[PDB]
Design an enzyme around this catalytic site. Structure first.
Site, PDB file in Angstrom:
ATOM      1  N   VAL A   1      25.731  32.452  55.108  1.00  0.00           N
ATOM      2  CA  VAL A   1      26.583  33.439  55.030  1.00  0.00           C
ATOM      3  C   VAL A   1      27.499  33.112  56.455  1.00  0.00           C
ATOM      4  O   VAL A   1      26.904  33.041  57.463  1.00  0.00           O
ATOM      5  CB  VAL A   1      26.181  35.060  55.315  1.00  0.00           C
ATOM      6  CG1 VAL A   1      27.257  35.963  55.583  1.00  0.00           C
ATOM      7  CG2 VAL A   1      25.146  35.273  53.926  1.00  0.00           C
TER       8      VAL A   1
ATOM      9  N   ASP B   1      17.384  44.745  44.780  1.00  0.00           N
ATOM     10  CA  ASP B   1      16.898  44.386  46.363  1.00  0.00           C
ATOM     11  C   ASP B   1      17.587  45.099  47.370  1.00  0.00           C
ATOM     12  O   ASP B   1      18.015  44.753  48.263  1.00  0.00           O
ATOM     13  CB  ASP B   1      17.465  42.947  46.584  1.00  0.00           C
ATOM     14  CG  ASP B   1      16.999  42.145  47.598  1.00  0.00           C
ATOM     15  OD1 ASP B   1      15.640  42.355  47.934  1.00  0.00           O
ATOM     16  OD2 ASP B   1      17.481  41.334  48.127  1.00  0.00           O
TER      17      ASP B   1
HETATM   18  C1  LIG Z   1      26.485  39.275  57.009  1.00  0.00           C
HETATM   19  O1  LIG Z   1      27.224  40.470  56.898  1.00  0.00           O
HETATM   20  C2  LIG Z   1      28.198  40.666  55.639  1.00  0.00           C
HETATM   21  C3  LIG Z   1      27.441  40.076  54.661  1.00  0.00           C
HETATM   22  C4  LIG Z   1      28.198  40.339  53.359  1.00  0.00           C
HETATM   23  C5  LIG Z   1      27.477  40.061  52.039  1.00  0.00           C
HETATM   24  C6  LIG Z   1      26.213  39.564  51.760  1.00  0.00           C
HETATM   25  C7  LIG Z   1      25.993  39.271  50.216  1.00  0.00           C
HETATM   26  O2  LIG Z   1      26.310  39.846  49.480  1.00  0.00           O
HETATM   27  O3  LIG Z   1      25.159  38.525  50.277  1.00  0.00           O
HETATM   28  C8  LIG Z   1      29.461  40.947  53.407  1.00  0.00           C
HETATM   29  C9  LIG Z   1      29.808  41.292  54.601  1.00  0.00           C
HETATM   30  C10 LIG Z   1      29.239  41.281  55.827  1.00  0.00           C
HETATM   31  O4  LIG Z   1      29.913  41.553  56.896  1.00  0.00           O
END
Ligand SMILES: COc1cc(/C=C/C(=O)O)ccc1O
Length: 328
Positions: free
Chosen positions: A51, A154
């Site tokens: 990510v 989850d």
């Molecule tokens: C880590 O910060 C984020 C993660 C996600 C999505 C992660 C996923 O769907 O696995 C979306 C916005 C964020 O700011």
């Protein structure tokens, strides 16, 4: 064999949807322009993805990019289809784009950015009112996705992104989510250990949306009692024993007997006999300001062995615990 089970709500949502809706294996991905997104910094690496914070250079706005690790195309298409189905729903993370990453040669999902304070620090500062407020916000997301025929599977603090400044919440990481089909048997190797429902831990495969409600209850317990995680098992077997030391062993046997389920014989030497406990035993001077009779009743009605007995998300939103929460 095991007694079959059905969700008590939204049972036939997918039955009456067009096939296109739930048949994710046939989904055709609509790809955006990968050059629209510039990676800025790595935020984390999970089991299934990396990510990144990134910038959308067509609007100079922050986004999050999730570059999927190589998995079967179905799980990739599953997550994609579910995100597209749920887009715009209350407190559902918004999938903004899907691009092909040239390095990983896998899909990179582009999400709205959430300016989140991480849950170890956030949970330490949440007030009673904050907990009720954010629980209600999570329930909006869960009732929405359940009403749309999807179980998240989850639910855990890591996947509930909270921007505490704007009091904004998003349920993320739909990579384990599934479509609910009545009578379908599912993989029990889902959710994180501390949030696994009894149905997973006794290997009952015909589960449903109510799995998410157990997970939510584990979150609630950790927040109002200031103990994270609440059920702190060393493995999946010890996890069920930790639950049984609180909910008791007689009701565990009632559960598995109702569905004509057999415990793994390895529990013979580790499970013991345990009374059901009253939730008050977990209250002490450092968490009592987070606890109320309403909180404990609400918790009690989420954390049931029998998945059919748990509050649904909608029922949960009707609970007196949320009477204090200002409605929009
Ligand atoms: C880590 O910060 C984020 C993660 C996600 C999505 C992660 C996923 O769907 O696995 C979306 C916005 C964020 O700011």
């Amino acid at each position: 064999g095991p007694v079959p089970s059905r969700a008590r709500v939204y049972t036939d949502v997918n039955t009456h949807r067009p096939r296109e809706y739930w048949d994710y294996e046939s989904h055709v991905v609509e790809w955006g322009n990968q050059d629209d997104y510039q990676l800025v910094r790595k935020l984390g690496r999970g089991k299934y993805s990396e990510v990144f914070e990134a910038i959308n250079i067509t609007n100079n706005e922050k986004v999050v990019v999730k570059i999927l690790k190589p998995v079967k195309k179905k799980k990739i298409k599953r997550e994609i289809k579910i995100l597209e189905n749920l887009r715009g729903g209350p407190n559902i993370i918004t999938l903004a784009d899907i691009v092909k990453d040239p390095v990983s040669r896998t899909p990179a999902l582009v999400f709205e950015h959430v300016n989140n304070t991480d849950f170890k620090q956030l949970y330490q500062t949440l007030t009673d009112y904050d907990i009720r407020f954010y629980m209600y916000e999570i329930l909006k997301a869960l009732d929405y996705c359940h009403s749309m025929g999807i179980m998240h599977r989850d639910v855990k603090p890591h996947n509930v992104m909270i921007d505490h400044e704007h009091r904004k919440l998003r349920l993320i990481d739909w990579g384990l989510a599934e479509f609910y089909h009545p009578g379908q048997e599912y993989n029990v190797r889902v959710a994180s250990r501390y949030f696994k429902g009894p149905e997973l831990l006794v290997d009952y495969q015909m589960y449903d949306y109510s799995l998410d409600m157990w997970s939510l209850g584990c979150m609630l317990a950790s927040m109002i009692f200031r103990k994270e995680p609440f059920f702190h098992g060393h493995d999946n077997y010890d996890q069920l024993v930790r639950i049984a030391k609180v909910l008791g062993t007689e009701d565990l046997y009632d559960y598995i007997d109702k569905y004509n389920i057999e415990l793994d014989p390895r529990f013979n030497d580790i499970l013991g006999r345990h009374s059901r406990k009253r939730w008050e035993r977990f209250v002490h001077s450092e968490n009592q300001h987070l606890v109320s009779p309403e909180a404990l009743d609400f918790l009690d009605k989420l954390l049931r062995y029998d998945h059919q007995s748990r509050l649904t998300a909608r029922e949960a939103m009707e609970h007196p615990y949320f009477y204090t929460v200002v409605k929009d």
